[PDB]
Unconditional design. Structure first.
Ligand SMILES: CCCCCCCCCCCCCCCCCC(=O)OC[C@H](COP(=O)([O-])OCC(O)COP(=O)([O-])OC[C@@H](COC(=O)CCCCCCCCCCCCCCCCC)OC(=O)CCCCCCCCCCCCCCCCC)OC(=O)CCCCCCCCCCCCCCCCC
Ligand SMILES: CCCCCCCCCCCCCCCCCC(=O)OC[C@H](COP(=O)([O-])OCC(O)COP(=O)([O-])OC[C@@H](COC(=O)CCCCCCCCCCCCCCCCC)OC(=O)CCCCCCCCCCCCCCCCC)OC(=O)CCCCCCCCCCCCCCCCC
Ligand SMILES: CCCCCCCCCCCCCCCCCC(=O)OC[C@H](COP(=O)([O-])OCC(O)COP(=O)([O-])OC[C@@H](COC(=O)CCCCCCCCCCCCCCCCC)OC(=O)CCCCCCCCCCCCCCCCC)OC(=O)CCCCCCCCCCCCCCCCC
Ligand SMILES: CCCCCCCCCCCCCCCCCC(=O)OC[C@H](COP(=O)([O-])OCC(O)COP(=O)([O-])OC[C@@H](COC(=O)CCCCCCCCCCCCCCCCC)OC(=O)CCCCCCCCCCCCCCCCC)OC(=O)CCCCCCCCCCCCCCCCC
Ligand SMILES: CCCCCCCC/C=C/CCCCCCCC(=O)OC[C@H](COP(=O)(O)OCCN)OC(=O)CCCCCCC/C=C/CCCCCCCC
Lengths: 69, 65, 119, 49, 74, 99, 61, 99, 75, 50, 185, 269, 75, 75, 75, 23
């Protein structure tokens, strides 16, 4: 048998940490919106990648497709 | 055994081939004194499980309960 | 992924494992159980799991999601659609990484090279 | 011809065949081949059926 | 038939209808063959994140207690 | 084993039909993001990829990804979190592969 | 190998009075000479296989 | 193959009794101390550990919890963030993981 | 689509077949009532009742046919 | 197996969820109707053969 | 003549496009509903507008109604409301079934007192009442099988046996037997 | 300290929604009447579960409801071959002992699972990895031997096969990478600069016309005269395209006593 | 395909033929019942019962036809 | 295929013709039973027996057609 | 080809026409027997044998029709 | 694994006749 402590403690732990990830997830999306196309494609990119701009297109920045908070 | 992944040809426990059989206990006193059927209610959880309650008594005192 | 409307039934059966499931074609008889009127083209009924999807939309348009959609003809379409895409996703992954499990694959029972025979 | 070309799955028990781990310890390192995917099974002349 | 919703979307079944003839209809199925291999590859480039984020490690010695669920036999 | 047996008994079946909004078996994420992909949008193709990755998670019923042990984003309690954070499908597929 | 050899179908006589369709049909059948082609496996009768079109009425148990 | 077939790696001795089949003994089995002896032996270890092994404990537990992480880059982050800027190799020697 | 609709209305026309048979059956029934009455007029009230009852059974088929008719025409 | 006493055919739908879409009160509505048709098949058979 | 619209073709040159129009126009089969027409079709009259399956407003409104109680809440409130329900394992959850199935017995205590004079009339009543029970019990004989009750799926199903691994494997997994027909090692 | 309620309760706002799938007047009328008195009716049963009380599932008349199992052709015969076709009937008939046994898992799906290695074997792996990142691989022989000794042999065979599978899946994902990153003849010399500023919507029905004649009102003003003229123009172009045609290839499946190739089937019989 | 559906809905109309014949057969039966009653009214109750009995047999065919009709209309 | 099936189901509809004549013959049968009973009611049971006996020979033809109908519809 | 086969099956339906007239001729036959019986019941046996005898010849033609029916359908 | 399982390398057509199974 697996510990009953783990099953119930981990169920609370996971949900309590998702609430803190939601807040961090918001600040990242906010800070990335104020970032240039050059930065969001070169930062965290592979060293061997040579950046080449793409044609500018209109793509909305919607956090939750469903009208949720 | 079927759900566990072993397909079963035939049926019963009267193994036609090279297997040991276990006939039912002969209903006579000779075998009824030497053998007795396995009571499932005697298979228990180890009482060491109850020693985990020691954590509860310690946490209660740590929190001032 | 299947890039056609038809697939050989044997190509999704196991060769070295018991066959407890098939991957059948869409059940067209369920389309005639809808009492209401609808427009359906025959060019969309053979592709996998899509007919059950369109039927679900037709039932969610005629009825809603509360106390009217809960009728046997409409719930079975929603269940078939949810189940068809789950099995097909599993068979598709098993086809991608475990092609040796299925009938018709040359790796299910590899044929030896002539140099392995000693002639 | 159909029953000549009617085989059963899984062949024979592999554990009753010579192991590769044993040949290595005996002094013969086996070579790994690939599956022959180009051959098509066919039945012989009728006289052999 | 994996990547169902992706394939159904590339074929355009969300906004239009397929041609009613097999010749052109079967060519359109084989047309997304390149794109599925691309979208499949994109999905295999995700960077990792700490597994100890929304899930406690079950191999921690803390969970060696093998504790049961206490119940009330109503 | 030989234990106490009853003459008459009832066996419950907690069926996961997926078509009943009365219980927790209703997959709200799948139906919402599926109905969302039906409408014309710029992300119409992105929502399709999210759904195909959600199906690849249900396909992995391992000890670290299952409702029985109440794992996050696999149990009935956490089905609503998918509506807010569908990006975590990759985090799971890697987690199940790590353990 | 033993299973494979066992599938090579044996020869089963056409003469059958146990199935009433053949009891009637075989009275009008013409026995024509089967000219030897040089083999030992000429299927001039039906075959002892459950899936043979002339033996499906026979119960193989 | 026989269904009741088992391969055992340690010696066992079977009883040569009528109507019964069981393992009556294990060759060269030494009886250790009794439960009451090991109990007293452990009480002495827990007592000294209770009186003399509780100072400077909060720091060692943080190091131990940091080293239970999956990747090394997270361990280093745990030590720098929770353990007040501790070194990887310097903490591994305190815990006893260094050779 | 349009063809079956044409077949629906056609069947709806066939409903007038029992209507025709009911006319003949009606004249026949009252024909016997007139004769049967001359044989034993003392009980006219009895025969008269049985006569009308039969007519009720005749129109029963009528309502049934028209009933079935409109059904297939709209169902 | 619902008509068997102490059935051991566990793989024969005994351990599965078996629902139907017929009329409920089965032994009052459906099963009697199956015997009604049975009585017709045997009465029609007697009349024809006799 | 060709009519223009918002939906455009995919050809760069105008010749390829004109070839596509002449290509499609050469396959048109006109079916008119008016007599005295060279292309007249009483039946089998083809429509000139294609139908497209789309989610209606009743479709999109009911899906948005399923999320109504969430739009008024934040993510933290959603978790604390529907996810992090304080554990309380003191309730007799199975009372729901004891009341339902126990009613057959209580109903029998009342029904066995029917003032129907004829004994064989009450035979029909109990036969009808038994038909109601056997829809759940299934097998009328004792020590033969189990009743069948479909229950709602909740997070508390098998809550007190989640720790046992063999109970999960027995309920969830139907293992596929292999040619080497043995239980997994 | 009130009992916890699930999200479904806030949708219906009641525990007693009398949901019956059987669409007969007798059943739905009784349900509507029962749905109203559920608050003061002792014969009330819940269909919405809660923390304090379980609930029943969907009702089918007096019995219970479950969807028809997904069609499965696997079956087992008893007396004679029934030739079961799950697509021939809407609802699956009950299995009779002397007729048929259906496949297992009326309501089941295909998943992938994994056996959980023993706790002591897991601890030996944690010690090796830990001693590896600290002391290096060359100083972990004793910890490696503890794995080969304590871990049962079936566990070591699983560990051996895992590495062989992920080696297989690695090559399969890299072959897909190659076919994906292959530059076709129609994209030679083209880069991101040659891409048009279009999004997914620009390829839908509103902007990109489908390949059908009645997708819009483009060909609605076409007369029969314009059609006859177009047939003459397309036939003129065929005086230049019909000049060539692929040559007939030899039949690879000519011999019926040979394993035939699974060649693409003809569009039409 | 569509043509079979058309002939089906049409055959369903054919069921109105027994509905028509049953009407005429009813008129004839009650016609004789009236004459039969006048001949011997002492047994009015006997004739009356047998009269309705025959009609019950007439509706048997009616039910047999409509039954066969809806079946062929859906099978 | 369907077209041949269309004329098969079409034939299946023709089976309702004996079902129609059987009703008229039934009405005629009970009509004679009534008048015949009035002339000699002393042998009621005798007439009654032969009445139902004839109605059986009617259905003999009826069931025969239905057999022929379903057969050719599937054979 | 397809046309002729559709006509063959069609003729096979026409064979159900005598099946209809046989029903009417049957009811009429037993209708008269009841009258003939009530007229002179002393000679019941003679009437009865002749009654069933005629019926035999009646369905004889009916069986004869089915022969021609299957003939053209297969010959 | 079903005991009456066979892998055939040439096409066969099975008759869809009641009470019988054959090629
Ligand atoms: C002439 C005809 C000859 C032909 C004969 C027929 C031959 C063909 C046979 C065909 C067989 C059919 C096969 C059926 C398949 C199913 C079999 C099965 O699964 O059984 C499993 C089941 C498993 O039990 P087990 O393996 O035997 O024992 C281990 C269990 O764990 C133990 O279970 P537990 O843990 O739950 O309980 C343990 C125990 C613990 O309790 C105790 O120990 C305390 C004991 C106190 C008992 C008091 C009882 C209550 C009384 C209250 C009144 C006040 C008492 C005051 C005194 C008390 C003082 C303290 O409690 C009891 O078990 C009580 C037992 C009651 C015994 C009373 C009768 C005494 C013997 C009667 C012999 C005569 C009848 C046999 C036929 C004779 C023919 C010549 O075995 C049973 O069969 C149970 C009995 C059911 C038998 C019926 C079987 C047929 C089914 C249909 C019959 C329906 C019954 C009504 C019929 C109409 C009657 C009028
Ligand atoms: C005891 C009593 C029991 C009751 C017994 C009940 C028995 C019931 C019998 C019912 C079964 C037989 C009926 C068959 C119907 C088939 C014909 C049909 O319906 O018209 C379709 C037919 C085709 O539609 P369309 O508008 O031409 O399509 C134009 C597209 O461009 C076309 O191009 P597309 O690209 O769209 O292709 C469409 C495709 C679609 O194909 C399909 O989906 C199904 C096609 C099946 C065709 C099978 C062909 C088999 C080859 C037969 C070869 C011989 C045929 C000629 C000889 C027939 C006599 C044996 O191909 C076709 O449409 C093929 C149709 C070709 C024409 C077939 C010849 C028409 C029948 C000739 C007689 C008509 C008048 C008779 C006078 C009646 C007066 C009482 O309509 C016509 O051609 C024009 C004439 C329409 C009929 C006249 C309307 C005026 C009013 C007449 C009053 C009577 C109405 C009926 C009730 C009768 C009760 C008295
Ligand atoms: C001052 C004089 C009086 C003036 C007032 C006059 C007005 C009187 C009526 C108003 C007051 C009623 C008081 C109770 C409130 C009930 C309100 C309500 O809405 O109930 C509707 C209630 C619920 O409707 P439902 O949702 O359809 O549930 C029934 C389903 O069958 C259920 O089927 P299922 O499958 O869904 O569920 C199975 C079910 C089990 O269901 C069954 O198995 C029963 C099935 C029926 C038999 C099967 C054959 C059915 C054939 C179909 C046709 C039946 C027609 C019956 C029509 C009866 C019309 C009332 O098990 C359960 O669900 C839970 C059962 C456990 C409940 C335990 C009992 C709690 C009740 C309170 C106990 C204290 C009351 C006093 C004790 C009794 C007197 C000694 O309908 C019924 O009551 C059904 C009849 C049951 C028999 C009750 C007879 C009691 C009469 C007592 C009269 C008062 C005492 C007389 C003293 C005389 C001296 C003065
Ligand atoms: C100041 C006053 C104060 C007091 C006021 C009190 C007011 C009381 C209000 C009560 C409110 C309603 C009560 C609701 C609770 C019902 C509880 C319950 O057990 O019902 C369950 C029962 C079963 O439904 P379920 O279990 O909930 O399942 C849902 C669907 O059924 C599932 O769909 P499915 O298709 O799967 O189900 C199949 C369907 C199958 O289809 C059927 O429904 C079968 C019915 C077909 C036959 C219909 C004809 C019946 C008429 C026969 C009598 C006619 C006489 C006159 C004819 C003249 C002709 C011109 O249903 C069944 O299986 C039914 C089986 C159970 C019934 C059969 C056994 C009945 C026993 C009869 C024994 C009678 C002996 C006398 C005893 C009387 C007292 C106990 O539900 C009902 O039947 C509701 C009954 C509604 C009453 C109808 C009125 C009947 C009128 C009787 C006329 C004779 C008496 C006249 C007296 C006049 C007095 C002035
Ligand atoms: C039935 C025995 C009655 C007499 C017995 C006398 C001996 C008494 C000895 C009792 C010793 C105490 C042992 C502990 C008892 C435990 C009871 C139990 O487990 O169930 C309690 C549990 C409490 O519910 P929860 O909120 O979920 O649990 C919270 C826990 N704090 O109670 C229940 O399950 C509810 C049902 C209780 C029994 C109901 C009685 C049924 C009879 C119904 C007829 C009554 C009239 C009805 C009229 C209806 C009018 C609308």
């Amino acid at each position: 048998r697996t510990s009953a402590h783990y099953i119930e403690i981990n169920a609370i732990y996971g949900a309590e940490m998702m609430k803190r990830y939601h807040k961090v997830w918001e600040n990242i999306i906010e800070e990335r919106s104020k970032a240039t196309d050059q930065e969001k494609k070169t930062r965290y990119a592979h060293p061997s990648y040579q950046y080449s701009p793409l044609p500018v297109v209109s793509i909305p920045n919607v956090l939750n497709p469903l009208n949720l908070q | 055994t079927l759900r566990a992944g072993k397909n079963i040809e035939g049926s019963g426990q009267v193994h036609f081939g090279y297997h040991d059989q276990k006939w039912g206990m002969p209903a006579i006193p000779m075998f009824q004194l030497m053998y007795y059927e396995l009571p499932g209610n005697s298979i228990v959880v180890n009482p060491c499980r109850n020693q985990n309650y020691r954590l509860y008594f310690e946490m209660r005192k740590k929190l001032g309960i | 992924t299947i890039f056609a409307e038809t697939w050989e039934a044997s190509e999704y059966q196991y060769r070295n494992k018991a066959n407890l499931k098939t991957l059948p074609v869409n059940h067209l008889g369920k389309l005639a159980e809808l009492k209401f009127d609808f427009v359906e083209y025959k060019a969309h009924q053979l592709i996998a799991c899509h007919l059950y999807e369109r039927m679900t939309i037709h039932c969610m348009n005629q009825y809603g999601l509360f106390k009217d959609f809960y009728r046997p003809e409409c719930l079975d379409a929603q269940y078939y659609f949810k189940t068809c895409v789950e099995l097909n996703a599993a068979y598709g992954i098993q086809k991608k990484f475990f092609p040796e499990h299925f009938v018709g694959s040359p790796y299910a029972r590899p044929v030896p090279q002539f140099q392995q025979l000693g002639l | 011809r159909m029953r000549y070309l009617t085989e059963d799955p899984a062949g024979d028990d592999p554990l009753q065949k010579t192991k590769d781990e044993h040949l290595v310890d005996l002094g013969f390192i086996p070579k790994v081949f690939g599956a022959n995917v180009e051959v098509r099974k066919r039945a012989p002349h009728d006289k052999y059926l | 038939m994996d990547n169902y919703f992706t394939a159904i979307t590339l074929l355009g079944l969300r906004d239009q209808n397929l041609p009613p003839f097999k010749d052109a209809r079967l060519q359109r199925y084989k047309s997304i063959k390149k794109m599925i291999d691309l979208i499949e590859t994109t999905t295999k480039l995700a960077p990792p994140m700490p597994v100890e984020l929304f899930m406690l490690n079950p191999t921690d010695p803390e969970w060696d207690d093998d504790m049961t669920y206490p119940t009330i036999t109503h | 084993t030989s234990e106490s047996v009853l003459a008459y008994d009832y066996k419950l079946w907690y069926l996961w039909s997926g078509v009943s909004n009365l219980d927790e078996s209703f997959d709200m994420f799948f139906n919402q993001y599926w109905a969302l992909s039906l409408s014309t949008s710029v992300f119409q193709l992105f929502y399709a990829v999210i759904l195909d990755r959600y199906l690849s998670v249900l396909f992995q019923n391992t000890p670290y990804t299952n409702d029985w042990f109440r794992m996050m984003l696999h149990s009935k309690e956490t089905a609503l979190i998918w509506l807010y954070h569908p990006e975590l499908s990759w985090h799971i597929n890697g987690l199940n592969q790590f353990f | 190998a033993t299973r494979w050899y066992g599938r090579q179908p044996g020869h089963l006589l056409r003469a059958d009075t146990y199935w009433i369709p053949n009891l009637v049909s075989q009275r009008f059948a013409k026995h024509q000479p089967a000219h030897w082609d040089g083999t030992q496996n000429m299927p001039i009768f039906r075959l002892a296989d459950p899936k043979h079109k002339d033996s499906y009425m026979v119960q193989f148990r | 193959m026989q269904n009741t077939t088992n391969i055992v790696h340690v010696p066992v001795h079977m009883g040569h009794t009528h109507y019964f089949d069981y393992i009556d003994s294990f060759p060269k089995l030494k009886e250790g101390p009794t439960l009451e002896e090991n109990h007293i032996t452990n009480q002495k270890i827990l007592r000294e550990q209770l009186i003399s092994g509780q100072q400077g404990l909060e720091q060692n537990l943080c190091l131990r919890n940091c080293f239970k992480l999956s990747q090394k880059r997270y361990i280093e982050f745990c030590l720098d963030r929770k353990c007040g800027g501790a070194d990887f190799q310097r903490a591994a020697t305190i815990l006893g993981y260094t050779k | 689509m349009l063809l079956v609709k044409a077949v629906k209305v056609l069947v709806m026309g066939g409903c007038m077949l029992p209507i025709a048979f009911g006319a003949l059956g009606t004249g026949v029934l009252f024909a016997g009532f007139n004769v049967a009455l001359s044989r034993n007029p003392e009980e006219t009230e009895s025969l008269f009742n049985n006569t009308l009852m039969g007519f009720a059974l005749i129109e029963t088929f009528i309502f049934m046919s028209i009933g079935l008719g409109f059904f297939v025409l709209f169902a | 197996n619902s008509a068997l006493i102490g059935s051991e055919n566990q793989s024969d739908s005994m351990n599965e969820l078996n629902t139907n879409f017929s009329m409920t009160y089965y032994i009052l509505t459906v099963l009697p109707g199956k015997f009604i048709y049975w009585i017709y098949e045997i009465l029609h058979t007697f009349f024809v053969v006799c | 003549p060709v009519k223009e619209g918002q939906a455009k073709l995919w050809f760069s040159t105008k010749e390829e496009a004109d070839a596509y129009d002449d290509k499609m126009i050469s396959n048109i089969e006109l079916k008119s509903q008016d007599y005295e027409d060279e292309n007249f079709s009483p039946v089998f009259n083809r429509k000139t507008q294609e139908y497209f399956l789309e989610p209606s407003e009743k479709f999109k409104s009911d899906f948005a109604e399923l999320l109504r109680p969430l739009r008024s809440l934040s993510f933290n409130q959603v978790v604390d409301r529907y996810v992090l329900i304080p554990p309380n394992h003191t309730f007799y959850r199975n009372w729901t079934y004891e009341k339902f199935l126990g009613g057959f017995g209580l109903s029998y205590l009342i029904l066995r007192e029917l003032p129907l004079r004829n004994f064989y009339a009450r035979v029909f009543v109990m036969y009808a009442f038994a038909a109601k029970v056997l829809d759940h019990l299934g097998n009328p004989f004792p020590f033969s099988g189990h009743g069948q009750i479909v229950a709602a799926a909740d997070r508390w199903n098998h809550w007190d046996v989640r720790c046992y691994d063999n109970v999960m494997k027995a309920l969830k997994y139907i293992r596929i037997p292999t040619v080497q027909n043995n239980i997994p090692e | 300290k009130a009992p916890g309620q699930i999200y479904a309760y806030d949708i219906h706002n009641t525990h007693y929604p009398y949901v019956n799938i059987k669409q007969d007047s007798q059943t739905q009328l009784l349900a509507s009447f029962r749905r109203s008195i559920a608050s003061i009716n002792p014969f009330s049963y819940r269909q919405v579960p809660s923390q304090d009380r379980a609930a029943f599932g969907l009702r089918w008349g007096n019995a219970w409801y479950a969807p028809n199992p997904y069609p499965n052709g696997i079956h087992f015969d008893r007396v004679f071959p029934t030739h079961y076709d799950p697509l021939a009937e809407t609802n699956r008939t009950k299995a009779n002992l002397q007729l048929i046994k259906y496949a297992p898992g009326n309501y089941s799906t295909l998943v992938v699972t994994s056996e959980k290695l023993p706790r002591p074997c897991i601890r030996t792996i944690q010690n090796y990895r830990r001693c590896q990142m600290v002391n290096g691989t060359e100083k972990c022989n004793s910890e490696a031997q503890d794995i080969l000794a304590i871990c049962p042999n079936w566990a070591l065979d699983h560990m051996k096969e895992k590495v062989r599978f992920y080696t297989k899946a690695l090559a399969i994902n890299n072959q897909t990478y190659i076919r994906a990153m292959q530059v076709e003849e129609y994209n030679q010399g083209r880069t991101v600069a040659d891409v048009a500023p279009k999004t997914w919507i620009h390829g839908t029905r509103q902007h990109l016309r489908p390949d059908t004649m009645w997708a819009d009102d483009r060909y609605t003003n076409i007369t029969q005269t314009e059609i006859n003229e177009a047939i003459k123009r397309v036939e003129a172009r065929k005086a230049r395209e019909h000049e060539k045609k692929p040559v007939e290839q030899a039949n690879v499946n000519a011999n019926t006593g040979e394993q035939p190739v699974r060649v693409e089937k003809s569009l039409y019989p």
